[PDB]
Design a protein around this motif. Sequence first.
Motif, PDB file in Angstrom:
ATOM      1  N   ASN A 184      -0.878 -11.158  -4.003  1.00  0.00           N
ATOM      2  CA  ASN A 184       0.208 -10.264  -3.525  1.00  0.00           C
ATOM      3  C   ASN A 184      -0.462  -9.016  -2.954  1.00  0.00           C
ATOM      4  O   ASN A 184      -1.427  -8.550  -3.562  1.00  0.00           O
ATOM      5  N   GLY A 185       0.012  -8.540  -1.800  1.00  0.00           N
ATOM      6  CA  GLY A 185      -0.551  -7.380  -1.082  1.00  0.00           C
ATOM      7  C   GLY A 185      -1.515  -7.802   0.016  1.00  0.00           C
ATOM      8  O   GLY A 185      -1.884  -6.932   0.818  1.00  0.00           O
ATOM      9  N   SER A 186      -1.902  -9.084   0.057  1.00  0.00           N
ATOM     10  CA  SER A 186      -2.903  -9.622   1.019  1.00  0.00           C
ATOM     11  C   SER A 186      -2.297  -9.905   2.398  1.00  0.00           C
ATOM     12  O   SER A 186      -3.054 -10.000   3.374  1.00  0.00           O
ATOM     13  N   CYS A 187      -0.972 -10.051   2.489  1.00  0.00           N
ATOM     14  CA  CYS A 187      -0.293 -10.380   3.767  1.00  0.00           C
ATOM     15  C   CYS A 187      -0.559  -9.267   4.785  1.00  0.00           C
ATOM     16  O   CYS A 187      -0.670  -8.100   4.386  1.00  0.00           O
TER      17      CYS A 187
ATOM     18  N   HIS B 290       1.065 -14.483   5.941  1.00  0.00           N
ATOM     19  CA  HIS B 290       2.477 -14.145   5.607  1.00  0.00           C
ATOM     20  C   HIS B 290       3.005 -14.690   4.281  1.00  0.00           C
ATOM     21  O   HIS B 290       3.881 -14.030   3.691  1.00  0.00           O
TER      22      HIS B 290
ATOM     23  N   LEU C 164       1.830  -3.689   2.578  1.00  0.00           N
ATOM     24  CA  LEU C 164       1.074  -4.828   3.167  1.00  0.00           C
ATOM     25  C   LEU C 164      -0.072  -4.284   4.027  1.00  0.00           C
ATOM     26  O   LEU C 164      -0.263  -3.048   4.042  1.00  0.00           O
TER      27      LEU C 164
ATOM     28  N   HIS D  40       8.166  -9.175   7.103  1.00  0.00           N
ATOM     29  CA  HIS D  40       8.738  -9.142   5.740  1.00  0.00           C
ATOM     30  C   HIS D  40       8.281  -7.870   5.018  1.00  0.00           C
ATOM     31  O   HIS D  40       8.790  -7.613   3.894  1.00  0.00           O
TER      32      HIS D  40
HETATM   33  C1  LIG Z   1       2.828 -11.959   1.723  1.00  0.00           C
HETATM   34  C2  LIG Z   1       2.656 -10.907   0.661  1.00  0.00           C
HETATM   35  O1  LIG Z   1       1.563 -10.402   0.440  1.00  0.00           O
HETATM   36  N1  LIG Z   1       3.765 -10.580  -0.031  1.00  0.00           N
HETATM   37  C3  LIG Z   1       5.064 -11.235   0.145  1.00  0.00           C
HETATM   38  C4  LIG Z   1       5.535 -11.849  -1.157  1.00  0.00           C
HETATM   39  N2  LIG Z   1       5.488 -10.870  -2.245  1.00  0.00           N
HETATM   40  C5  LIG Z   1       6.542 -10.590  -3.035  1.00  0.00           C
HETATM   41  O2  LIG Z   1       7.682 -10.950  -2.761  1.00  0.00           O
HETATM   42  C6  LIG Z   1       6.298  -9.822  -4.304  1.00  0.00           C
HETATM   43  C7  LIG Z   1       6.997  -8.662  -4.589  1.00  0.00           C
HETATM   44  C8  LIG Z   1       6.743  -7.966  -5.759  1.00  0.00           C
HETATM   45  C9  LIG Z   1       5.789  -8.401  -6.663  1.00  0.00           C
HETATM   46  C10 LIG Z   1       5.514  -7.646  -7.934  1.00  0.00           C
HETATM   47  C11 LIG Z   1       5.091  -9.559  -6.362  1.00  0.00           C
HETATM   48  C12 LIG Z   1       5.339 -10.263  -5.197  1.00  0.00           C
HETATM   49  C13 LIG Z   1       4.190 -10.206  -2.378  1.00  0.00           C
HETATM   50  C14 LIG Z   1       3.800  -9.558  -1.070  1.00  0.00           C
END
Ligand SMILES: *CC(=O)N1CCN(C(=O)c2ccc(C)cc2)CC1
Lengths: 304, 304
Positions: A142-145, A164, A27, A41
Motif C-alpha cells: 500500500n502506498g506503492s501505486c 494501480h 500515492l 484513484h
Molecule cells: C494502489 C495503492 O497503492 N493503493 C490503492 C489501494 N489501497 C487502499 O485502498 C488502502 C487504503 C487504506 C489502507 C490502510 C490500506 C489500503 C492502498 C493504496
Amino acid sequence: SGFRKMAFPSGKVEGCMVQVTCGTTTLNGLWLDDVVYCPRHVICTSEDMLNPNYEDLLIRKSNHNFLVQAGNVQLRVIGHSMQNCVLKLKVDTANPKTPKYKFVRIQPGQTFSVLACYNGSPSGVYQCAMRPNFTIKGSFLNGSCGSVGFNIDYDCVSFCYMHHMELPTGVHAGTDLEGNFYGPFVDRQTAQAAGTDTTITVNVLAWLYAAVINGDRWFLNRFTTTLNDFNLVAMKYNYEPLTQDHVDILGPLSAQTGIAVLDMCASLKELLQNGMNGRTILGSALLEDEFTPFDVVRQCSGVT
Amino acid sequence: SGFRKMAFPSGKVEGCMVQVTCGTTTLNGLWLDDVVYCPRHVICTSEDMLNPNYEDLLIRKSNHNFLVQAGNVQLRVIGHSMQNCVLKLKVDTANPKTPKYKFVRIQPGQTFSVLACYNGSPSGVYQCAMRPNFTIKGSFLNGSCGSVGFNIDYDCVSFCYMHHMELPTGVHAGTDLEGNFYGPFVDRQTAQAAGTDTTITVNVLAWLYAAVINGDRWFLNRFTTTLNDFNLVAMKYNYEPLTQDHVDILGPLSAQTGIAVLDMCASLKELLQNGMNGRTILGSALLEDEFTPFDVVRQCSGVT
Ligand SMILES: *CC(=O)N1CCN(C(=O)c2ccc(C)cc2)CC1
Ligand SMILES: *CC(=O)N1CCN(C(=O)c2ccc(C)cc2)CC1
C-alpha cells in the motif's frame, strides 16, 4: 561472464518521483516537464474504491486539493485533467531533472524495470515482464501505486507502466502513461481474475542462449524440431506459441552461439518433457522467461 | 504483496562513476569528494597481469598518466597513492554529487546492489551476496572492473565492494573500498580456485518467512527441530551452520508470522530431505539465499 536479473540504473527516474496527496490517500506521482502523472484513484476514499464514478468524484476536487511534494518542497498545481485512469496535474515548475522520455505501451513478454516508491521516495528497483495475461508479478505494498516501469535507450527513458492495483491473487495490474490498463483490468475493488499465465517462449530461448554464452551447456541435445512440432509441445506446457517473428528476433543469438533457433527449440522441448533432473541453468531450477532476446544481447554486450 | 530480488535505487552511485584510463586499459572509478578510487590493475598491460609488481609498475606512472573523465569532462589528477589493491587519485574538484557515504567491509552472507558500469557509464543494477567462499556471482564483462557494490541506509551509501577479477570458473572477486580483497584472492592472472560455495542458511530462512508473509505456505510442516539436529542436516547439504545469533536476527520475522525459528528450521529440513517435488516458493524451484533477514523486513515494510 555471469548472467543476472538486471534492472536499468534508476537515477533518471528517481529524479521524477513525487508524493501526491488528495485528502487522506498518499500515492506516487511522476513529474515530467510541468506535469505530474498519478493514478486517478488518489481521489478515492477506501469506500469510493468499491464502485467509484471518477468523473463525479473529480468534480468535488480543485487544483488546491492535490498536494504535490518533490523532496520536501511543495509544487503549485495550476491545472488537473483525467486521461483514462491517470490524472495529469499541471504544476507551475518544469521538473529540472526531466530526462529525455517517451511514453510506450509494451506488448506481453516485454520486460522493464520498476522503481518501487513510497511517499515519492525510492525503496528499490527490480526487473519485471508484462505477463501474457497482462498482469505483472511485482513487489508492491500500500502506498506503492504511481510507481512506474521503464526501459532506457542510452539517454531516453521509455515509461511503459504505472502501478494501480493488486488483484486478490497478489499479482499486479496497471496502466501505460496514457492511463490505459494493460489487459481487461479496471481501477475498482471488485473480483477480477487473471487469465492463464503462459510462459514467454521467446524469452526462455533467449535465456537458454544466455546460458550457452555463459558456459551452462549440459541441456544442449542432439535434436532439432520444426515450429509446428515445437508448438504442439509448447501448447501442452502452457508456453506461448513461437512464430517466425520470434525466430527472426533470436537470429543474432543463434549467430553468436552457432546454435540454430530450431535446435535450441528441440533442447527446450526435451527440458519441458524430461524436467531439469535436479540440475540448474544460470543458478535457476526453472526456465526463466523474464529476459527478452534484446535483454540478453544488451547484458552480454555491456550497453550503457 | 509479491517478493522480488530488489536492488537499491542506484542514482546516488550513478553520480559517482567515472572513467579511469592508464595507457590502453580503461576501467571504472568511484569519485567521492576529491578522490577517485579504482582497481590498481588499471596500470597493467595484459602482459603485466600474469605476474605484476604494482609498486614497481606504479613508479613509471605520473598524475598526468591517469586520465579521469566524469561524463565528457576531464578531471585534473593532483595526486595518486596505492592503498592495498586500489588506487586513490586526488583530483582538484570535489564531486558535487557526492552522497553521504561510508566504506564498510561486509561479512559472508551479506547482500548488496552492484551498479555494473563500462567506461564510467551505468549499464545495470542487480542484487548480490558475498558468498561464504568470498566470491560473488555477478554479471561483469571486460571494462566492468571499478564497478561497486553498496547498501543504502536512508541517505547514506555504504560502499562494500569494488569489482577486480573474474576467476577461471566465471565467478567474481573484488575488494572493499580500502582495497582489501574479500577472501584469499589476489589481482594476478593466476589459477585461483574458490572454496565450497555453501548455502547461506539464515538467508534461506528469512526468504521462507518472506514466502509465508506473501502467501506461499505449502512447505510449512507439523515438525520442529533443535539447532544441533538442524545443523547435522545443514552440514550434510552444504548449508552454513545456524547459530543463536542467526535465530536472534530472525526474531522479528518469527514474531510477525507467529512461526518459531526452529519450526521454520524443521520445514527447511524436510525441503532439503524431500526436495520441492516440482513445486515453487516465491516463483523459485530452489531455496534462495541472497535475501538477508534485514532485506526481508525492508522489502516487506517498504523502507525508502
Ligand atoms: C494502489 C495503492 O497503492 N493503493 C490503492 C489501494 N489501497 C487502499 O485502498 C488502502 C487504503 C487504506 C489502507 C490502510 C490500506 C489500503 C492502498 C493504496
Ligand atoms: C577487471 C577488468 O575489467 N579487467 C581486467 C582483466 N582484463 C584484461 O586483462 C583484458 C585486456 C584486454 C582485453 C581485450 C580483454 C581483457 C579486462 C579488464
